[PDB]
A paper describes a structure:
To understand the conformational changes upon mutation in the basic patch on [name], we also crystallized phospho-[name] [name]/[name]/Q347C (3C)-pUb complex after treatment with 3C protease, which washed off pUbl-linker (1-140) from [name] core (141-465). This complex resulted in better crystals diffracting up to 2.35 Å. The overall structure of the pUbl-linker (1-140) depleted [name] [name]/[name]/Q347C (141-465)-pUb complex (hereafter R0RBR [name]/[name]-pUb complex) was similar to the autoinhibited structure wherein RING2 was bound on [name] and REP element was bound on RING1. In the crystal structure of R0RBR ([name]/[name])-pUb complex, out of two molecules of [name] in the asymmetric unit, one molecule of [name] showed nice electron density of the linker region of [name]. While T410, I411, and K412 were facing outwards in the apo R0RBR structure, in the structure of R0RBR ([name]/[name])-pUb complex these residues were present in the core. Interestingly, we noticed interactions between the linker of [name] and pUb from the neighboring molecule of the asymmetric unit. The core of interactions between the [name] linker and [name] was mediated by I411, which was involved in hydrophobic interactions with the hydrophobic pocket of [name]. Other interactions between [name] and [name] included ionic interactions mediated by K412, and H422. Water-mediated interactions between linker and [name] included T410 with the carbonyl group of R72 of [name], and T415 with the carbonyl of G35 of [name]. Furthermore, E409 formed a salt-bridge with K413, which could be required for maintaining the structure of the linker region for [name] binding.
[name] is an auto-inhibited [name] E3 ligase activated by dual phosphorylation of its [name]-like ([name]) domain and [name] by the PINK1 kinase. [name] is an autoinhibited RBR family E3 [name] ligase consisting of an N-terminal [name]-like ([name]) domain followed by four Zn2+ binding domains [name], RING1, in-between-RING (IBR), and RING2. Like other RBR-family E3 ligases, [name] binds to an E2, and [name] is transferred from E2 onto the catalytic C431 residue (on RING2) of [name] before ubiquitination of lysines on target substrates. Furthermore, C431 on RING2 is occluded by the [name] domain of [name], which inhibits [name] activity.
Author numbering:
A (entry chain C): 142 to 385, 393 to 405, 413 to 465
B (entry chain D): 1 to 74
The structure:
Amino acid sequence: IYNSFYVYCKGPCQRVQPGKLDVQCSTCRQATLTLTQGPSCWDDVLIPNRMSGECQSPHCPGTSAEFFFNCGAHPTSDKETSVALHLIATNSRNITCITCTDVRSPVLVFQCNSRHVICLDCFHLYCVTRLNDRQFVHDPQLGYSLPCVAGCPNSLIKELHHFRILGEEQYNRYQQYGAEECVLQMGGVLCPRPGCGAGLLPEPDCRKVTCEGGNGLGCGFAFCRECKEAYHEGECSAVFEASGVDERAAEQARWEAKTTKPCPRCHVPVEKNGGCMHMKCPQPQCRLEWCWNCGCEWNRVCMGDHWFDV
Amino acid sequence: MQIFVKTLTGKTITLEVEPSDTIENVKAKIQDKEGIPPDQQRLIFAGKQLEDGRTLSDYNIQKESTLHLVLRLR
Ligand SMILES: [Zn+2]
Ligand SMILES: [Zn+2]
Ligand SMILES: [Zn+2]
Ligand SMILES: [Zn+2]
Ligand SMILES: [Zn+2]
Ligand SMILES: [Zn+2]
Ligand SMILES: [Zn+2]
Ligand SMILES: [Zn+2]
């Protein structure tokens, strides 16, 4: 099976799995929207109202396509959607990993200018070590993320669901660490009482902070913002004694570092559109719909598994 | 769908929401459940503070997912 799309299944699977793409009319919300042409890239499926066509349902003037992803490891309730991870790709280009230099699949492709690629095993390691060391980066607009391993500029992962690679317990830890980091960057504080750690955003010019709330919300500890001990009027007395990528590999691990198949019906040759695997024969007397990848007539399987490639 | 709102303590509030629900609406439902006025609430997803005029779907927050609640002390 050729899978173009990876999702996170949150039960039954509870893991990153091959995904199935599907489309519905945005108005009637039925699988009635036939597209003029298939999606060719991730923007086509992720940005609302980007793609258009015709609702086959007659009691509907719908024209706009709504794309959604389901897990590919089992049948799903029609509305049992999973989050797509648009950075993950099948390694159809045989690109080496920036860290381990192996040709693995699937891979993650960073949105740096170089489009550096890392295998999902090395991405996991990156995430775990950086989460354990609290070296994830906080951006006020993007949240708790990681950049390209090469440290390229403007390369923080935007879709934070990619951190689902970490697994359920570690994902929760990531979100916990992210919240704490968000608080601290806002000039807030965490309650220092063991078993609490409540996030508090007090006035910037206040030294006494109370862990406010009832027995449900807060613990009532009043602390000094400076030393993080209980509030006091003196100087702070607490003392804390501090105990305490290769360039060649990076060059090769770039995503952008023959292709003629005859049409099954009319046999006029065609080269790939790059992305869309859904061919509609451009010859006016044929117009056979077929899959580039499989050389077969178009079907729901090719649709779900590899409507487009990267 | 359900979202879980958690304090950094681990205390969990269960809400029934829709993707189209605003963060302000989420705060209203928190007010109703815990009696925290919306003004005193700050909601965070994956390290990002959520804006009141944005929807859950704007942040791609999925069913069963968890928002972190932090308190604004004035
Ligand atoms: Zn699944
Ligand atoms: Zn329709
Ligand atoms: Zn890079
Ligand atoms: Zn690797
Ligand atoms: Zn506390
Ligand atoms: Zn102090
Ligand atoms: Zn043809
Ligand atoms: Zn196919």
